[PDB]
Amino acid sequence: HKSEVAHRFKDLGEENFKALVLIAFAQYLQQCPFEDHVKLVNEVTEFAKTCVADESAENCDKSLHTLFGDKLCTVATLRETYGEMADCCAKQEPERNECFLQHKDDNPNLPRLVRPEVDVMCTAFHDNEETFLKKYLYEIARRHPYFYAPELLFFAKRYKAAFTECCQAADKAACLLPKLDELRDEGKASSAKQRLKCASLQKFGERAFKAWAVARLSQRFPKAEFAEVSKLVTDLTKVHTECCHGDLLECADDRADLAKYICENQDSISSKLKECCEKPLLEKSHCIAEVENDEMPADLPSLAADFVESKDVCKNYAEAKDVFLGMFLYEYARRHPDYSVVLLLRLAKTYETTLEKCCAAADPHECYAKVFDEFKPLVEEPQNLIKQNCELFEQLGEYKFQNALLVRYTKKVPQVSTPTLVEVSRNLGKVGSKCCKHPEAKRMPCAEDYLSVVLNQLCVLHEKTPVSDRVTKCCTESLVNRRPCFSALEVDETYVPKEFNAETFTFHADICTLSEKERQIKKQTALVELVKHKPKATKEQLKAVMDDFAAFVEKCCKADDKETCFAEEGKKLVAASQAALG
Ligand SMILES: CCCCCCCC/C=C\CCCCCCCC(=O)O
Numbered sequence: 001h002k003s004e005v006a007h008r009f010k011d012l013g014e015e016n017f018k019a020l021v022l023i024a025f026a027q028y029l030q031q032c033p034f035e036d037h038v039k040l041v042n043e044v045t046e047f048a049k050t051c052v053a054d055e056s057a058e059n060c061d062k063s064l065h066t067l068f069g070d071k072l073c074t075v076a077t078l079r080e081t082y083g084e085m086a087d088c089c090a091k092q093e094p095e096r097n098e099c100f101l102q103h104k105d106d107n108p109n110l111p112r113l114v115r116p117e118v119d120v121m122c123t124a125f126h127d128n129e130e131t132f133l134k135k136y137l138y139e140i141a142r143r144h145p146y147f148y149a150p151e152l153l154f155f156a157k158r159y160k161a162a163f164t165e166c167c168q169a170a171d172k173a174a175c176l177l178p179k180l181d182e183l184r185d186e187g188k189a190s191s192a193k194q195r196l197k198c199a200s201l202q203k204f205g206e207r208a209f210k211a212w213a214v215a216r217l218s219q220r221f222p223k224a225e226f227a228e229v230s231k232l233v234t235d236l237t238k239v240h241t242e243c244c245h246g247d248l249l250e251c252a253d254d255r256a257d258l259a260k261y262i263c264e265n266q267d268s269i270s271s272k273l274k275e276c277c278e279k280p281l282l283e284k285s286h287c288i289a290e291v292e293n294d295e296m297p298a299d300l301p302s303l304a305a306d307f308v309e310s311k312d313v314c315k316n317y318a319e320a321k322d323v324f325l326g327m328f329l330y331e332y333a334r335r336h337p338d339y340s341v342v343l344l345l346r347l348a349k350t351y352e353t354t355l356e357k358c359c360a361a362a363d364p365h366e367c368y369a370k371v372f373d374e375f376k377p378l379v380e381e382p383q384n385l386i387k388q389n390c391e392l393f394e395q396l397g398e399y400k401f402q403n404a405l406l407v408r409y410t411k412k413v414p415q416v417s418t419p420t421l422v423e424v425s426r427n428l429g430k431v432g433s434k435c436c437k438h439p440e441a442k443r444m445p446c447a448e449d450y451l452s453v454v455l456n457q458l459c460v461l462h463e464k465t466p467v468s469d470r471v472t473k474c475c476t477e478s479l480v481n482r483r484p485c486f487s488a489l490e491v492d493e494t495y496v497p498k499e500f501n502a503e504t505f506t507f508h509a510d511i512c513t514l515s516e517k518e519r520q521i522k523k524q525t526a527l528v529e530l531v532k533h534k535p536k537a538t539k540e541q542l543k544a545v546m547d548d549f550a551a552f553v554e555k556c557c558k559a560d561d562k563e564t565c566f567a568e569e570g571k572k573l574v575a576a577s578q579a580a581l582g
């Protein structure tokens, strides 16, 4: 039917097509020059215009993969540069393309991208703003070959809108930097979420994934019927598999097909989809995936009815276990948008466990009559933690809240690197700052969202440089008990204090010229070292030492001649503190 290129070109528009072709090629030819890819893009774009003018034009009939594959193999250096990958050009289609996906190197050997000065950046932006955005688009795409292209394009437009609104302000840095930080964090989270979902699919199986998807979908579309939700879980599962495989083209088609489906049965799924279903092809699925929870019917029976009281349960269960259990989740999840998905799964595993013990006993109904009774504690566990932690967060504020976490975790896993403990504690604080501003009904979902990517990054790291069997236990265990296992970590009684070191607790006046972020990291780094040296110190002994240090920095940063007060009063602080911490 017609021409694929022409079609995609008409749907996307020239501007989007060119930016997407750039990203796609950058993700395969990660080592080729920018000017080389631009040549490529122009060539393909010109070809695509040929097809838009005449569908019968040469090669215009060819499939996207084939056209794409032919273009890659057309690169001169290829073998000289990539070597192995060049041998892919010797194969037929299904093979050739699969051969390229295998050589798509994740975690390249490229330099870190350094953020330029707001001024140089803004000035480059005013000059060729297009080549300014494409170069960076190219730089980020080659470093993240797995990042879904259209999404990367959505972030790029937000960056563009920020340079536009900021490069014209009185104080540019004041405007730009703050939003460049939000975008970075946002981009890293999305990137991590993505690897997280794919790793989970791989590590735990499609069953676990389907369970997660049912719960998640039911919270969002509480009005949808179970048959509808199972339909979506199935398709959603096929989408994640191919999108994880890395094949951009297949992934995009599956996503478009799904969003189209959902939009066509809009009224049969959710009322909060109107906006998203009006958007262009490029942003539909992305919009839908971010859509807000629809409101629940209000005309819903009780869970006790069909799952706890009604005999006919084991019968209905033995008939199709997973389906029955899926029904339980659907029912429980659409009634609880306020629960995290993992909590929902813990309740479902608990219920499964019960049906599996009771349905085989003499009087079934009398064995599982009090099951909802066993849910209470599972539910209270996270709620209580969130309540306790957000109260504390509101008490001391972000920075001081980060310190509280710092002391807490260093004490639980002293074997961890100081820079890693600092990074972890800081990220956790931002979660507290993002999620505690929410009402009690949106807090667990918020925390789950952020905590999962933080806990995963943590584990992949530990997977590389192991440090504690305890961490490994929590990291390799069930994805449903991952967080509870970390919450259960106890202070490390075993650990042996790190012998004193003055260099470690030696401060200089430079901490006064430092920026807010740099001196925090400076102080926090020391705080971790302090706890690693005297792990048996009280929250109070520590508060006292931290207070003595506070005034220290003050009565020395505001003193005539610094680098001395710092060595004089410093010697004192350390000698006195050593005594306090007996
Ligand atoms: C991990 C991918 C998510 C990040 C999205 C990036 C989108 C790229 C679009 C335009 C380039 C912006 C140029 C500014 C670079 C500064 C990057 C940084 O702060 O780390």
Ligand SMILES: CCCCCCCC/C=C\CCCCCCCC(=O)O
Pocket (backbone or CB within 6 Å): 340, 342, 343, 382, 385, 386, 389, 390, 428, 429, 431, 432, 435, 436, 443, 444, 446, 447, 448, 451, 483, 484
């Ligand atoms: C509102 C979230 C509060 C975030 C504060 C950051 C401190 C992290 C420590 C404990 C938070 C525990 C939250 C547990 C909910 C995750 C979902 C789950 O496991 O059910």
Ligand SMILES: CCCCCCCC/C=C\CCCCCCCC(=O)O
Pocket (backbone or CB within 6 Å): 385, 409, 413, 416, 417, 420, 421, 424, 458, 461, 462, 465, 467, 471, 483, 486, 487, 488
């Ligand atoms: C040397 C680097 C290797 C990686 C080491 C991993 C370090 C883990 C450090 C701290 C654990 C994070 C705390 C997890 C949140 C649990 C929530 C709670 O407190 O209830």
Ligand SMILES: CCCCCCCC/C=C\CCCCCCCC(=O)O
Pocket (backbone or CB within 6 Å): 403, 505, 523, 524, 526, 527, 530, 533, 534, 545, 546, 549, 550, 573, 574, 575, 577, 578, 579, 581
């Ligand atoms: C027995 C070991 C003695 C070590 C010497 C102690 C010197 C003090 C060292 C580190 C304190 C770190 C400061 C953390 C509090 C930051 C709070 C704030 O910003 O005001």
